[PDB]
């Protein structure tokens with residue numbers, strides 16, 4: 001591991017997001033910021049909000065510059081409205097550099113901030129193409145690279161605990177690592193496999209095959225990427241296109257058929273609980289996603305365990321049972337490889353080489369019988385046809 005200063009700089013959990021500490025302004029104002037590879041705006045609470053115990057105070061920053069422009073960002077989930085400006089930004093546990101970056105000062109929001117998440121802003125790490133108001137608003141990471149010598153690459157190790165973290169525990173627990181400008185080899189085991197970034201807007205990839213316990217889901221691969229497939233730390237669940245979700249759930253139900261679960265469970269809405277330590281991991285199937293490789297006609301697969309797709313939640317009775325929610329849900333906007341999927345892997349966003357790398361995470365949750373995996377190569381033909389074109 002060559003980036004010790006950035007190792008263990010993340011906190012949080014899949015259900016509320018993973019955040020990194022940042023400072024904005026002069027003198028520096030410390031804020032916790034949601035790491036979001038699924039959007040491209042850097043925005044911070046800039047006005048009192050019931051769920052915020054701190055916010056960006058522009059009038060206290062001598063380096064604050066007003067862009068005299070409003071900004072609106074409607075995500076899939078919530079939304080916020082703000083005022084554009086620029087200011088000096090640093091990452092305490094990051095590269096020892098300070099950059100001037102665009103900042104959306106959030107003045108109004110709806111279903112955006114999360115009670116108890118401990119974060120006050122969002123760091124959109126994707127490309128300018130999806131930045132609001134438009135692509136002229138340079139994203140933070142682009143500014144970082146243009147203004148410093150930091151390599152155009154970042155890597156994420158999101159660490160799920162495998163069990164519930166109460167409010168005090170999640171504040172004292174290490175949630176992972178965001179290595180800015182490099183790859184830290186202590187964060188993964190085995191080899192890194194790379195899939196092409198199809199197009200630079202979201203971190204778009206192409207899934208070419210899906211297996212549930214080795215059984216081919218057997219759908220036209222274009223269905224897996226309808227209308228796109230993205231890697232998104234800002235979404236908890238693995239979200240799948242309607243038809244793919246229907247097929248996957250039918251197969252996961254068939255594989256786990258020795259136990260019957262209520263429809264509410266499969267809808268990702270209700271928890272299921274087992275007596276302490278008795279979660280029947282073995283009845284649940286592993287899920288493999290095959291991704292386009294960088295070599296013509298070659299693919300590789302990432303394999304996740306139910307310890308990734310079943311999200312630990314506290315029992316509504318705080319009892320001693322081990323409880324979980326099904327973290328796979330339906331999408332109308334394409335596949336979203338969310339945080340629960342990212343928790344099984346060290347993910348390298350190699351912007352410089354337009355590729356995303358995956359390796360088994362040194363912090364993925366597993367059991368003595370099965371582990372997450374990244375394996376290759378596989379001969380795969382016509383993978384370009386798996387991509388969707390509007």
Ligand SMILES: CCCN(CCC)C(=O)c1cc(C)cc(C(=O)N[C@@H](Cc2cc(F)cc(F)c2)[C@H](O)[C@H]2C[C@@H](OCc3ccccc3)CN2)c1
Pocket residue numbers: 014015016017034036037038039040073074075076077078079111112113114130131132232233234235236237
């Ligand atoms: C339930 C709260 C949120 N949690 C739990 C915590 C992560 C979730 O699991 C969850 C569930 C769903 C169904 C959606 C989102 C979501 O929108 N997540 C947002 C980031 C985000 C927004 C927010 F309001 C609150 C957040 F905690 C994080 C991502 O950017 C999506 C948006 C989409 O790109 C659209 C887009 C639009 C404009 C500009 C750029 C991109 C692809 N990536 C998050």
